[PDB]
C-alpha cells in the first residue's frame, strides 16, 4: 500500500476544514531554563492551559506574574528560540477517554506508548475535575478483594475505600499491587496501574506479568519513564485519576494503583523549585499535601444516584529507613483511608506480605468486607495485636501461664496461617476457610510448622470434596451453620489425612 487510496480521505480532511475566526492569546517566550518557560506577554492565559510552542512540546502554565507566566515543558523542549510565538490552546489539560484504552500502555499526554495503535476517543475529561460531593456519596459498604490473605483478613479494602500501601523500598510493594490487580479477574474491576518515575524495564516486567496473567486485557497502565520531564512525571497520576473517573462515572467500579507517589511529590517539587515557588519544610513545596489531596479525593465510592461505582485507590508511598516521620508519608497518612506497612523485618523474616497489624490499619473496617468473614473473625485483628505484644512479652519466657501459653501458641499458629506463597491469590471462600480453621482452634493441637501443608491439604480437600460450600457462601456472603458443618466435616477428614500422615 503506497500512493493508492488515501487521497480521498486527504480531500475529505482538507475540504471541510475550519478557517476559524479564533482570536488566541499568544506569547513571546522570554525565559526558558531547565524545563520551565517564563514567557513574556501572554496576558489572558488560564493557569492550567496547555501552551503550544514552536516545537510541539506543549506546556502547562502553572504560575503567572504581572509580567511573566510560569510555564512548564511537558515534553522537554530542547530547542526553543527566544521570542517564539508560544500561544496557548485555550482548553484546560483535557484528556480523551475510552474503553479502548483497556490494555494500552498510555503516556500522560493520553498517548499510547504500547505500540498497539492510536485510540479513538470522544470525551475530553479535565485534569482537575474535583471530588464528588459530600452528600452525594455513600459509605464504603461493599467488599473488594485483594487475593492476599492478611490484608483481607485484618485490614480490609473496600470498593471506594482508599487504602494506602506504604513501606520501605524493595519489600514487595509493587508485587502486592500487581497481585491485588490480577486478583480481579471476574469482579468487573478496572485497574489503573499508574506507574510513576521508576524503571521502564520494571514497567515492562509488570506488563509482561500482566500479559502472562491475562490481566492486561482490562487494565490501563500509565507508564512514566524516569527520563520524562518532571511536569509529566507528576502530571500522570491526575491523568490516571480522570481516566478512572471516566469509568466510575458510568456505573463501573474501578481500582487505581499509583506507583509510586513519592516520585510524584519529588517531580512536583522539582517543577515548583524551578518555578521559584518557595519551598515549605523538608525542602519540599508545602502543597504536596494539596496535590495529593486533590489526587486521592478524586477517588471514592459513588452512590445509587450517580452510578454506585467506586475508585478504590492504592497510592504506594516510598519511605526511607522505615520512617513514618518523613514529610510525604506524613501527608498521605493524614489524607488516606488507613495505611498498611511493609516492614523489611517482616518481609525478610518470612511474613510475605509483611503487614504487621501493630502499625498497619484500615480505618473504615469490616463493613468494607464480607459478612461471612465478619461473623467468623472480626476479633482476630485485635487478637493478633495482643499476640504480637505478648510474643514481644514472651521474650521473658521462664514460667509462662498456661492460659497465655495457649494464647501465644494460638496466635503463633495464626501468624503461620498469615503466610502465603508467591502470587497465590486465594479464593475469598478459601480465606474464610483458613480464618475459621484458625479461629476454631483445630490447628491448636496440630503441628505448628506444618500449618501451610495442613492448609494446602485442607483447601484441596474441600475444593475437591465440598465445593458446594464455596458457592452457597459466595451467594450468601454469610457464615451459616451449613458452612460451619461443611467446614468442620472436611476439617475432620483432612486432619485425619494429615495425621496419617
Amino acid at each position: 500500500i503506497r500512493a493508492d487510496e488515501i487521497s480521498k480521505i486527504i480531500r475529505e480532511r482538507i475540504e471541510g476544514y475550519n478557517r476559524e475566526v479564533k482570536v488566541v492569546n499568544t506569547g513571546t517566550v522570554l525565559q526558558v531554563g531547565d524545563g520551565i518557560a517564563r514567557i513574556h506577554g501572554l496576558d489572558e492565559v488560564m493557569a492550567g492551559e496547555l501552551v503550544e510552542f514552536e516545537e510541539g512540546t506543549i506546556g502547562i502554565a502553572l504560575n503567572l506574574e504581572s509580567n511573566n507566566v510560569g510555564v512548564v515543558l511537558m515534553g522537554d523542549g530542547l530547542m526553543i528560540q527566544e521570542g517564539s510565538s508560544v500561544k496557548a490552546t485555550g482548553r484546560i489539560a483535557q484528556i480523551p477517554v475510552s474503553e479502548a484504552y483497556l490494555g494500552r500502555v498510555i503516556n500522560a499526554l493520553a498517548k499510547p506508548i504500547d505500540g498497539r495503535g492510536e485510540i479513538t476517543a470522544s470525551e475530553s475529561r479535565l485534569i482537575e475535575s474535583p471530588a464528588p460531593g459530600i452528600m452525594s456519596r455513600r459509605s464504603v459498604y461493599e467488599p473488594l478483594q485483594t487475593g492476599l490473605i492478611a490484608i483481607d483478613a485484618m485490614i480490609p479494602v473496600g470498593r471506594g475505600q482508599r487504602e494506602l500501601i506504604i513501606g520501605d523500598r524493595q519489600t514487595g510493594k509493587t508485587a502486592v499491587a500487581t497481585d491485588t490487580i490480577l486478583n480481579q479477574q471476574g469482579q468487573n474491576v478496572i485497574c489503573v496501574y499508574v506507574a510513576i518515575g521508576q524503571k521502564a524495564s520494571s514497567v515492562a516486567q509488570v506488563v509482561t506479568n500482566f500479559q502472562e496473567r491475562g490481566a492486561m486485557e482490562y487494565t490501563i497502565v500509565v507508564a512514566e519513564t524516569a527520563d520524562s520531564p518532571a511536569t509529566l512525571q507528576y502530571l500522570a497520576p491526575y491523568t490516571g485519576a480522570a481516566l478512572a473517573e471516566y469509568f466510575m462515572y458510568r456505573e463501573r467500579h474501578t481500582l487505581i494503583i499509583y506507583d509510586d507517589l513519592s516520585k510524584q511529590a519529588q517531580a512536583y517539587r522539582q517543577m515548583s523549585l524551578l518555578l521559584r515557588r518557595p519551598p515549605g519544610r523538608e525542602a519540599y513545596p508545602g502543597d504536596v499535601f494539596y496535590l495529593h489531596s486533590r489526587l486521592l479525593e478524586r477517588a471514592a465510592k459513588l452512590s445509587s444516584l450517580l452510578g454506585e461505582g467506586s475508585m478504590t485507590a492504592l497510592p504506594i508511598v516510598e519511605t526511607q529507613a522505615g520512617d513514618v516521620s518523613a514529610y510525604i508519608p506524613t501527608n498521605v497518612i493524614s489524607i488516606t483511608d488507613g495505611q498498611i506497612f511493609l516492614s523489611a523485618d517482616l518481609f525478610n523474616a518470612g511474613i510475605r506480605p509483611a503487614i504487621n497489624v501493630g502499625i498497619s490499619v484500615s480505618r473504615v473496617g469490616s463493613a468494607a468486607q464480607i459478612k461471612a468473614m465478619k461473623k467468623v473473625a472480626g476479633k482476630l485483628k485485635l487478637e493478633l495485636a495482643q499476640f504480637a505484644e505478648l510474643e514481644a512479652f514472651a521474650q521473658f519466657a521462664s514460667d509462662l501461664d498456661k492460659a497465655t501459653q495457649n494464647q501465644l501458641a494460638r496466635g503463633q499458629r495464626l501468624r503461620e496461617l498469615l503466610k502465603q506463597p508467591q502470587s497465590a491469590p486465594l479464593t475469598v471462600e478459601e480465606q474464610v476457610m483458613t480464618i475459621y480453621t484458625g479461629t476454631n482452634g483445630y490447628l491448636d493441637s496440630l503441628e505448628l510448622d506444618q500449618v501451610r501443608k495442613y492448609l494446602v491439604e485442607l483447601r484441596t480437600y474441600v475444593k475437591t470434596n465440598k465445593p458446594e460450600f464455596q458457592e452457597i457462601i459466595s451467594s450468601t456472603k454469610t457464615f451459616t451453620e451449613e458452612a460451619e458443618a461443611l467446614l468442620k466435616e472436611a476439617i475432620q477428614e483432612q486432619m485425619e489425612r494429615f495425621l496419617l500422615q
Partner: protein, 479 residues
Amino acid sequence: KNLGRIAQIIGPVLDVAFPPGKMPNIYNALIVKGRDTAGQPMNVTCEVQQLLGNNRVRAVAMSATDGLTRGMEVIDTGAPLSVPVGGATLGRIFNVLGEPVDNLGPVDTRTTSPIHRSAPAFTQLDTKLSIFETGIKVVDLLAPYRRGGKIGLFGGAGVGKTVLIMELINNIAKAHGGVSVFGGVGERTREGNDLYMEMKESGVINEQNIAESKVALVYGQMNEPPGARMRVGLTALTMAEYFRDVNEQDVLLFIDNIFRFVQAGSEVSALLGRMPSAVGYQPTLSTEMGSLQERITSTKEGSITSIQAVYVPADDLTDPAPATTFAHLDATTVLSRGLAAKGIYPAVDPLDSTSTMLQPRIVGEEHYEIAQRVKETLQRYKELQDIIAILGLDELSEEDRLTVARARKIERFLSQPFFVAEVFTGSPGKYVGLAETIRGFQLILSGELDSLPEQAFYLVGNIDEATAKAMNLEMESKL
C-alpha cells in the same frame, strides 16, 4: 468602582490590583465571577490578608484556582465575609462561604454574621468551672472534661481521634439539649460523609424534617484550597459564636482537624510573600490559635464547649503547633501509637493526657485518689517496661512485679468498646458510668481482682462484664 484586575495568580494566592480610588481593607471577601472553563457563570470567592502596595493586594481564594485568568474583574463586597447563621442554618451541610452543599434547597440566608469578629474578653467569659461526664471510661476517670471548657484530642497518625469524635458525638449530642455544631475543618470527606450518615441514622440530623436538628454540619474539604481551609474553621466558629451570643444556648463544637487549619495557614503564608518559621508552619501560628481559642470561650451570656481533634505530624509534642495548642487547651487527651499497636482503644497516653478539671475537690476526694493511684502504678509500669524488655519480668522484683501485672490489667481494662467501633472490633460497645469505672478500678488498684486473667479485662465496658468474661475464659481453659 470597585472593579480591579488580578495581576498575579500563583497557586491559590491572587495578587489583585485596584484603581487608586478604592483599595479595600483586610479580610474582605472578593468574588471573581461569571467565568469558568465552560464559559460558565462560575464564581470564586477570595479574601485578602496582605495588601502589597500600589493600591494592589494579594488575596487567598476559598475555591479552586482553575477558571480565573489574570486581568479579570473582582467584586469586593465592601465588608469582611459574612456567614449565614441561624436555626435555619442547622441541619444542612454548607460551605465556608456559606453555600449549602447539601445540593437540595438552600437555607434561608437573612442573618449573616461576619466571619472575622472580636474575641470575647474574660469579663464576658463564664469563669464558672464545671464538670462533664461523657461516658467513655478513661476520659471520665483521668481526663474529666469541663462542661464549658475547651477539649483537645491530641491524636497520632490516624489512630483513634476521629472514631473517638464519632463515639463522643453519639454519646453526648442526645445528652446536651442545647445546640450543637460539627466543624469539618479539612476533614477526610468520606469519613465526614460517614459521620453525616451516622447523623442521618441516629436522627440527630432528622433527615425527614430539619431545623429541629440541634446539630449543625459545616465541612471544608481537604481537596479544597488552603484558602478555603484557612477560614472554614472560622466559619464553624462563627456559627457556634452566633449560637453562643444570639441564641446563647449550650453549644457543642467538634472541629477536626485544627492542624489542618494550621497547615493551610502555613501553606498559603509560604506563598503570599512571607518568611517561614520553625518546623512546619507560618510565623502567624500563635495568632491563628489565639483568634480561635479566644473566640471559643464559654461566655457569661452563653455557654460553649468546643471539643477538637489535634493531629500532630510525626506523632510528637515538640512540634510547634501542638506546642501552642496545648497552651491553648484545657482538656487534653493524647493518643499513643504504642497503645494503638497493642490494640488498646482509645489509645490514650494517660501519663500525657491530663485536665484542669482533675482537681480533688472538684472530682471527689476518693475519685482523685483513684486517679492518682492508677496514674502512679501506670507511670511506674511505663518506667519499668524497658528494664523488663532486657531483664525479664520474672527477675523484676516482686514489689514491682505485682504492680506491672496490675497496671497491665489496668490499661486493657480502660480499653472499652464503642457503639460505632463494633465494625472494627466485633462486639457492640458500651456506655460506661463513672461510678462503675471507679468501682472496677478500686478493685484492680487495690488488688482484689488480681486473680482474674489480664485478657479478661480486654475490651470490656463493665468490671462485672469483666468478671463474666473471666468466668468464660476459665470455662474455656477447662474446655
